[PDB]
Amino acid sequence: PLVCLADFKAHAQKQLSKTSWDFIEGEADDGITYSENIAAFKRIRLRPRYLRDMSKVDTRTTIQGQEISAPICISPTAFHSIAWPDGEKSTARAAQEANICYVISSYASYSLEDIVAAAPEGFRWFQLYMKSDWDFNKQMVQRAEALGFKALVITIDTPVLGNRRRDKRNQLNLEANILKAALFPKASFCWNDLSLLQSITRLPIILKGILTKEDAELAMKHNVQGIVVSNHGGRQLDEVSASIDALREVVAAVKGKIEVYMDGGVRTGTDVLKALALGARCIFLGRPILWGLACKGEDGVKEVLDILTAELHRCMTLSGCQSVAEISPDLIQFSR
Amino acid sequence: PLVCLADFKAHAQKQLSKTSWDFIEGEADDGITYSENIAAFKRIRLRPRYLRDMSKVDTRTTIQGQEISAPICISPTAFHSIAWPDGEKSTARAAQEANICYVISSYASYSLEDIVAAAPEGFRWFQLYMKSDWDFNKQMVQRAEALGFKALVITIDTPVLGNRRRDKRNQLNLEANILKAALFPKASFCWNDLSLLQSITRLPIILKGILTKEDAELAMKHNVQGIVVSNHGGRQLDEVSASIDALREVVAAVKGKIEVYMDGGVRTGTDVLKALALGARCIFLGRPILWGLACKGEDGVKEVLDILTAELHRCMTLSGCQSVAEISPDLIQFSR
Amino acid sequence: PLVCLADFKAHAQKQLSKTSWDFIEGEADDGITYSENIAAFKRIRLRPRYLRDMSKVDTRTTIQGQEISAPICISPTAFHSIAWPDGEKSTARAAQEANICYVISSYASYSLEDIVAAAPEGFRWFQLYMKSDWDFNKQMVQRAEALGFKALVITIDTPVLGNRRRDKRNQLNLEANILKAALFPKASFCWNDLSLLQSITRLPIILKGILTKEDAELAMKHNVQGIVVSNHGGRQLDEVSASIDALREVVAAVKGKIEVYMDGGVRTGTDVLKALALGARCIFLGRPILWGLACKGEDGVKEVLDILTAELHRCMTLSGCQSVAEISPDLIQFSR
Amino acid sequence: PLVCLADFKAHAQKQLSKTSWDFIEGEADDGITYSENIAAFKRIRLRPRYLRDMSKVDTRTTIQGQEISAPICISPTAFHSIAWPDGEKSTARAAQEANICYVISSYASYSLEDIVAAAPEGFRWFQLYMKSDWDFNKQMVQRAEALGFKALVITIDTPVLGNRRRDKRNQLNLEANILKAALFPKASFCWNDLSLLQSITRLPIILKGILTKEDAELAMKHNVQGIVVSNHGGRQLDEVSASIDALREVVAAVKGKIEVYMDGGVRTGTDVLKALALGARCIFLGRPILWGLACKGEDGVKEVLDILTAELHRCMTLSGCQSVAEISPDLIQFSR
Ligand SMILES: Cc1cc2nc3c(=O)[nH]c(=O)nc-3n(C[C@H](O)[C@H](O)[C@H](O)COP(=O)(O)O)c2cc1C
Ligand SMILES: Cc1cc2nc3c(=O)[nH]c(=O)nc-3n(C[C@H](O)[C@H](O)[C@H](O)COP(=O)(O)O)c2cc1C
Ligand SMILES: Cc1cc2nc3c(=O)[nH]c(=O)nc-3n(C[C@H](O)[C@H](O)[C@H](O)COP(=O)(O)O)c2cc1C
Ligand SMILES: Cc1cc2nc3c(=O)[nH]c(=O)nc-3n(C[C@H](O)[C@H](O)[C@H](O)COP(=O)(O)O)c2cc1C
Ligand SMILES: Cc1ccc(Sc2snnc2C(=O)O)cc1
Numbered sequence A, B, C, D: 001p002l003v004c005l006a007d008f009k010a011h012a013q014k015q016l017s018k019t020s021w022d023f024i025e026g027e028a029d030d031g032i033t034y035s036e037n038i039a040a041f042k043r044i045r046l047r048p049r050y051l052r053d054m055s056k057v058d059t060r061t062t063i064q065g066q067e068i069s070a071p072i073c074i075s076p077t078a079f080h081s082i083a084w085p086d087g088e089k090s091t092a093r094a095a096q097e098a099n100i101c102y103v104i105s106s107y108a109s110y111s112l113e114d115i116v117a118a119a120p121e122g123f124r125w126f127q128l129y130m131k132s133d134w135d136f137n138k139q140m141v142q143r144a145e146a147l148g149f150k151a152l153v154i155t156i157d158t159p160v161l162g163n164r165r166r167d168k169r170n171q172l173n174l175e176a177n178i179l180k181a182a183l184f185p186k187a188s189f190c191w192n193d194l195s196l197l198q199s200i201t202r203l204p205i206i207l208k209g210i211l212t213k214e215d216a217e218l219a220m221k222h223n224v225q226g227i228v229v230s231n232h233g234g235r236q237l238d239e240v241s242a243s244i245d246a247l248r249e250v251v252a253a254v255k256g257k258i259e260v261y262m263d264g265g266v267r268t269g270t271d272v273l274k275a276l277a278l279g280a281r282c283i284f285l286g287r288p289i290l291w292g293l294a295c296k297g298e299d300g301v302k303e304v305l306d307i308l309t310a311e312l313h314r315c316m317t318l319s320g321c322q323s324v325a326e327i328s329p330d331l332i333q334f335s336r
């Protein structure tokens, strides 16, 4: 059976074509950051406190004032139908049942209307890649607001697509019709455009992809409502810091002014625990959601969310943290 | 032939089912701490002193005032019959002949009465997991006292069981009847309960599982008689410090007020030597005892104890330490 | 298809004999530096700046006042006909079309006249190993000047040839006639000789092979016009610093007085980006040019240059650098 | 062909039984130090100085006032007939032709008389393990003096033999008659005995096995004439410092008062260069001499010595050192 996220990764590869698997992996260039996102979590050491009453451990928290069952949410990932026919509809149903936040990608296989219809009461954010035509941008954000999306995520680390060698080999070998059956390119978007976007929507803006204290400071000066510390899973600029390492300087720059989240390499409960101890308000999952879909559709996504939540509950119990508010830097060895 | 503990590990795996071997390994989650318990010993460097009269080297020491043949004892490990039919009776006979301390698990395959009967004169401690019913707790500790146990070990790092992936896969695949032929769950136990336990027994209490100076300080404030620095062999919360590394801060906090012991990753004589140099009064063995049983029953446990004692005698001879009292931090490179 | 330099490396090995491949690899002794030239690039971490207008990114720069399309040039490598029949003629045609600098080796398969004839308008430097007969040295540098070469590169790390074990085994096994169908030895050359060479030619001298601040200081005192920081690809003295690491101290010693370049281990765009951020004015490629020739002749060299230039353009776009002048130490994590 | 020491290692294994090879390897316990003796050399970085007149490079030096062709000598190794029938006679002939120092083991396959007869003019030292009977000790040292030995080497890291697992398995499996066709045990020897030995012989005493500044200081207080920094090739106490690392503190303690040498892991010319730069007067070879014998007898030992000398000459040429006196800490990166 599939008892951890790694089992879903292994089984998903068996259930997908080489081209689809290579797209879901997608490491850029030499693949240094893809590996370091995991290794950077593994080298952090935990300091547990024992003999505390852990009879009741609570994993709930809030993001942007909305309660969620655990600080484990879904990062924006394109094309869910590559993994499961029902695609984002399956993801939306699982996310609503789990009571977490689902960030829908700007390149979903299904329309926003069809995704919302699959799970009307789900908590969702929308990640939109802006275009040159601001008439389209305005219409899209107004559409998202009409459909009940609660925040807009602007991903800033993809002005051009990363250089993923396996995808490129696969593409030069096969016709687009088979590669996509069974281009982008936004480099001009800048802080100027962010301010304009903020002026046309009442939805809070969350910037995804920040890795430096300098960009975190600019984000705060532009009055955004949150930041997802992320290196896009090592799929964009490679040889940048692991996201769990970049989190430290972003949190130190922000000093609690706005919520800071992260994604990249979260696979087990202690990874979630470490991100929370280092200052993140919640983590987001990229590839594990696609592995869940590829293995079992809606039930696979739900199982991935449930397993990671159970692992977080277990390590909070073992480490002595009764609730998310009790997870602090004291848990981290020299770092903290 | 089996000439070192590693040979017993390899041969034991051949002599056991996959399910039983996976239980004896039992690493939690990604298995980081299981590996680091060994690697942390290997990276410490020794500073030998030569041209000393080592014609007579003595490995004897005392724990809680009782003399033992070497500072090498048996940590509590459940279900010895998984490895050898006679189980704990075989272990008890070997431990008595070796003249070391045997800590009997709270989940032994045989009753305390039958284990004591197998080796009436053996030096033994009892590790008891407490239950909600204090009538049962009182009866068990009084029973242990009646049977000649000399200390109670309270393991504090298991309020819930660790997440061991291989065991979980094996369990979901097989019926309990085959998995256990051929649940727990104490999270409420806290410092409050320790004080009550101390008030109902005259037996000294030894806390097992402490990894931090903060919990060591609390242990001393509660007047316990000893501490076993341990991460439960990397079977509970993973990604915590190796036990030989945690030993340093616990020893520094305790400053000789009470005896400090350790387990986790001890496989060769220099590992024992290093723990003693860093301040432990003795080490305890977990898995090697089960490997000894799986290979040869009583004789296997005795051989594991004899081999490790001979290795300790050899490295004390080579390093210039005539007795256990002469093993000091001067032997350790920058650390000390 | 071949989509990155690593693909050219793999395909080139398939297209060459063991003897020719071993010569192109050619690591000295235990091969420590050959590997470290790559590992030293991979461990440096980048700090990208996002939300900048990267609609136009320019990779052009100048070396010795001459504009080139990207800071990616060809280091001197002997015997191009080992890789492709047309040898240096193919390399020269590709270099001219790419508009970069081609440094021709002192041991080319074709005469300088035939190479220049293949691409009359190409930007070229000449690397000459000096001989004891200064009449010959004078004639060669005057010849190079007559043919339009724009600088002389003096390689200083080869007073004797490095000890390449595979080449040596191959040589003792085969007759020179097969090994070279299908000795050196300049240890006396010193600073005295450099000054004399400078007095007989109006061409600027670039020293290749400097790894230390002491030799960089001597180079500046002798008024040379540039330095290529290089360890000869780990083919000469092994167990020296990786070239990207030696670059830092050479740049710090030079303080912008003369241009500093580097070679050794450059395989992807971020390696070029890192060398430029650390102070190099451009990088040179050794083995990748031979891999390009072995795979596809002129078109292979052109593809290697085009691919690396496209990778540099991509990582400049992702990291926020609009032009080469904007690539600074701010991009490098603690180092800088 | 065999072009480096590693080739001799590989070929020797093919030419020996498993039992003999395991004895020549002989790592103790987990084999940490055997590997670190090599790794510690590989991680040191060299700083070459170029453009010097290296037309003449001289590898000669002196030890105890006697000139040798290179600072590369033969450490005491027991039982040369395990590798080649003529054993030490072959080694002695090669050592005399190479003009280096041969230290004969206390457990040679041939008598001192027969070894000296094979090469009367060779420069030799004698390593003698002392016994309880001082009548025998006196006779042996007087015998060595009569035979022209020029120094006595006292190995101090073997009060008991190291625990070599492979040897032990082989021994328990086979009868001594086959294991030795085709016990020790000196732990009482101490500083008291050294002073007595010094009083009965006019031969200079060299202590082998010192790893600490404390024992180096005691050696100087006892007025010995030299020290070989050595961990016995990782065959005795394991998990001690690599010998090239221990050399630094011994050299710092000695401050040039007496000659300091080293063995352990020397396999290539730069290893010799590094030991000399860090303060050793010469290095000694253990296993490579046995590999030379196993492959080709006398000619194999001579080839090993010649190859390592040629590698030292080459790296001195490349690094800018005209003679052994010019090899200094300036060659070593941050360390020095
Ligand atoms: C198949 C795939 C598609 C992705 N598509 C997007 C996308 O449309 N928008 C975006 O902001 N990030 C995208 N990402 C990046 C993810 O949001 C996330 O940053 C990344 O996968 C790192 O998290 P992980 O380690 O959990 O996979 C994608 C990642 C994958 C694997
Ligand atoms: C099969 C097995 C069962 C165990 N059962 C217990 C137990 O009942 N109580 C306890 O305190 N620790 C238990 N442990 C943990 C051990 O006491 C010990 O902390 C651990 O194995 C680390 O030592 P080692 O590296 O020598 O194996 C168990 C370990 C194993 C391998
Ligand atoms: C086959 C081959 C031949 C070489 N010939 C020369 C040469 O004639 N002159 C010189 O200065 N360097 C020579 N080099 C060294 C290269 O200029 C360059 O320093 C080295 O290959 C490191 O760059 P790389 O990592 O890109 O290969 C040679 C390297 C190779 C691989
Ligand atoms: C087969 C063998 C036998 C040895 N016998 C002795 C001996 O009789 N006396 C001694 O002082 N060291 C002995 N040594 C240790 C060597 O002198 C030397 O310290 C060691 O091999 C490390 O050098 P290496 O790395 O070059 O092998 C022996 C080593 C080997 C491999
Ligand atoms: C037009 C187009 C081109 C490429 C993609 S893939 C995507 S977009 N943002 N991030 C990713 C990613 O795979 O990480 C989607 C649509």
Ligand SMILES: Cc1ccc(Sc2snnc2C(=O)O)cc1
Pocket (backbone or CB within 6 Å): B026, B078, B107, B158, B161, B183, B184, B232, B235
């Ligand atoms: C009811 C029950 C459930 C699980 C076990 S196994 C045990 S208990 N304390 N430690 C371990 C361990 O395996 O490390 C024993 C009994």
Ligand SMILES: Cc1ccc(Sc2snnc2C(=O)O)cc1
Pocket (backbone or CB within 6 Å): C026, C078, C107, C158, C161, C183, C184, C232, C235
């Ligand atoms: C006579 C002769 C001898 C050897 C070579 S190979 C060369 S020369 N400078 N560098 C290299 C190298 O291969 O790195 C060329 C000509």
Ligand SMILES: Cc1ccc(Sc2snnc2C(=O)O)cc1
Pocket (backbone or CB within 6 Å): D026, D078, D107, D158, D161, D183, D184, D232, D235
């Ligand atoms: C009686 C006897 C016992 C063992 C040996 S082997 C030797 S002695 N000193 N060092 C070694 C070594 O192998 O490193 C030789 C003779």
